[model samples]
Target chain A: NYSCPIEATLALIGGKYKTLILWHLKDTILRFNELKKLIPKATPKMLTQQLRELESDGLIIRVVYPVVPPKVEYSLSDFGKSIIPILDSMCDWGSDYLESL
Target chain B: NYSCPIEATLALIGGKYKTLILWHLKDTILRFNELKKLIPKATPKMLTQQLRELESDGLIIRVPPKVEYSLSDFGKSIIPILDSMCDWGSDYLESL
Candidate 1:
């Protein structure tokens, strides 16, 4: 039985900004608000929920450094990144889609 | 301006079942219930909302009579990615 990839993929990389978050961190890690900066439209609440889901999903690692003020960074897992080859293809393709019209 | 590529992409293709609806119509056009069957988890109202958004997004086309749906030439660009997303998940599922 072949499940729809949209459902499958969406479950993993499907959050409103999750895939885009991954795209931003494709090569490096970022602080929480840095992500907030990338997705300025996302509420801190929504961003936290999305990141929390990604962390629980095993697609991202949330690391906290000990300090008076907390510092957090998010990095993509090898498995999480597994989809980017396909995702970038989608992004690139989706980008051209606008022009193709 | 990065402009949030995510937002940009989502603007073109965003919604709960938007991509799933597109995936369902990759090869052939389907009526409303056929899509409901493919995504048994989706409510008709939710399905209709997603389809309505896709139609407005210009990702998919909606036809009347029985309320049919199909991918447009633009929407087809996403089919490969959609298929890959699922096939990769299935492979991962089988592995563990």
Candidate 2:
């Protein structure tokens, strides 16, 4: 019923953690520990949960490496890549908003 | 110290309510009561608080009148105008 573009975008990437996850994933593919370092406020359990959601939603790709450390990396999909401009605009608008304030 | 673009965006409009406010304001200018009707889940006090924050942030323009209601010119400024393409891209990408 609530089928708005913003709603759809928010449904996938809304909330405190998801946006952070997207931001971290924008530059490089990160393993679980590396991601935790990027967002220290998030607990390991919470990160795992959010990552699973993002993976399931097709926003991120989970690449697993067959290694002793059980290496895994998270990267944005093409779908996710499309959001970069949105994030960029948000960033620009936000900076102006803060400066004006 | 966090100077990431995403971080900056979140700081300005990061809450559950702020995003909704932006979406509601996107269509047309509405009075407080009109806005409340659009977003029924929001209480009067909460709307007032969020509106004030948005007004302060310049994401919205608040115009006061004799009746004490307001109109906002929160239309995307040049910087935010670029964001419309972004929003459109998001909408398109989300559909696929």
Candidate 3:
């Protein structure tokens, strides 16, 4: 009935871009382009890959809007939302550690 | 007064080998040779490097004795302990 927390955490939010994407998505839903703008360092391809993985893993939901230029929005699922505090801790830790470094 | 937990955690236990080492060390103290046996996949150099890093980051204590080995004081530190519980959760989730 149980596996391990590390693997579970990794399965949900592993990879370089997933956590960063989740961190950004925690507060607001963002369309593809909008999310890309926030993560300038990530390539469109890598973003797509990470997004697909997160969605498939049930960490996020992707909503597509049929429109002129086409619109798509990504938001955290309930499970995803639950991970916000964890991500926040990661971000807070990362920031402070970088400062010390 | 507080830095971020993620970075602090990573600083202490980041990298491929560090976490595995800590997980193994959590229950018992082991000398270099003894620890190496548990992680046969890791090269001696890599294990040594991770141990040094963990010690420098204050996550574990390295006591040199005649037959020398090490222990984890960071185990008592609240955040690290909480994190271990978190790791147990992670491990449990992973197993399931």
Candidate 3 lDDT by residue in tens digits, A25-88: 8768999888788778788999999999999977899998889877889999887787766666
Model 1 alpha-carbon miss at residue A28, Å:
1.2
- Residue-level error in angstroms, candidate 2, position A76: 0.4
Consecutive 10-residue window with the lowest summed lDDT within model 3 chain A? A1-10
Q: DockQ: which is higher, 1 or 2? A: 1
User: Best lDDT goes to which candidate?
Assistant: 1
DockQ, all models: 0.50, 0.35, 0.33
> TM-score of each candidate?
0.86, 0.76, 0.63
Best-to-worst order by TM-score is 1, 2, 3
Which segments of candidate 2 are over 4 A away from where they belong?
A98-101, B1-3, B43-46, B56-58, B61-96
lDDT value, residue B70 of candidate 3: 51
Backbone clash pairs for candidate 2 read: none
Lowest lDDT sum, 10 consecutive residues, model 3 chain B, at: B73-82
Q: Which stretches of candidate 1 lie over 4 Å from their true place?
A: A1-6, B1-6
